[PDB]
Amino acid sequence: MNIFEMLRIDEGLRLKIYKDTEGYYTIGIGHLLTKSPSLNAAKSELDKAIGRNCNGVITKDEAEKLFNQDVDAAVRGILRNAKLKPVYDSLDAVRRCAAINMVFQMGETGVAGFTNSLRMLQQKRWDEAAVNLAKSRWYNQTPNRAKRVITTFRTGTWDAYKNLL
């Protein structure tokens, strides 16, 4: 497994504009278009992102291109963030994928909330980190995905993702 397979499992693939778990317009593999309630605003963002008039629908190749851009952005965001970069650099490869997954889902605005978890991950206190990570709106609102990501941090293996092919 790799970060693309992991996030494809967690986000799915949809070629028409849809609403994500928070009710925001999204397309492809978890590509957020806008937090605006306006479908027209989402359609404009989609056209700007793809570079043609899509009328709310894209091809699989286009979805995969947004996905590559979004993964690249998540990783670069971690490397630019003074609080995240040292933790990320301290981690092994599988756990780095769990970190990318979280940033892909939630962005970086709530990093301060995860200060204690980041410290436990940096210290390699995996069971304690796992317990701390679950005390979160993130876990309570998307528990099946949070559990897979947390198990990945706890074990440093892909067991939570092989399980469910």
Q: Which of 103, 129, 149, 150 binds ligand 3H2 (CB under 6 A)?
A: 103
104 is in an annotated binding site: yes
Rounded least distance, CB 102 to ligand 3H2, Å: 4
Give the shortest CB-101-to-ligand 3H2 separation in angstroms.
8
Q: Is 70 a catalytic residue?
A: no
Is 77 buried (19+), middle (13-18) or exposed (0-12) by CB count in 10 A?
Answer: middle
Binding residues with ligand 3H2: total (CB under 6 A): 14
Tell me the three state secondary structure of residue 61: helix
Within positions 57 to 96, which residues make up the interface with ligand 3H2, using CB under 6 A? 78, 84, 87-88
C-beta separation of 46 from 82 below 8 A: no
The Cα–Cα gap between 63 and 125 comes to 37
For residue 38, count other CB atoms closer than 10 A to its CB. 10
- For this structure, is 5 an active site residue? no
Query: Annotated catalytic sites, by residue?
Result: 11, 20
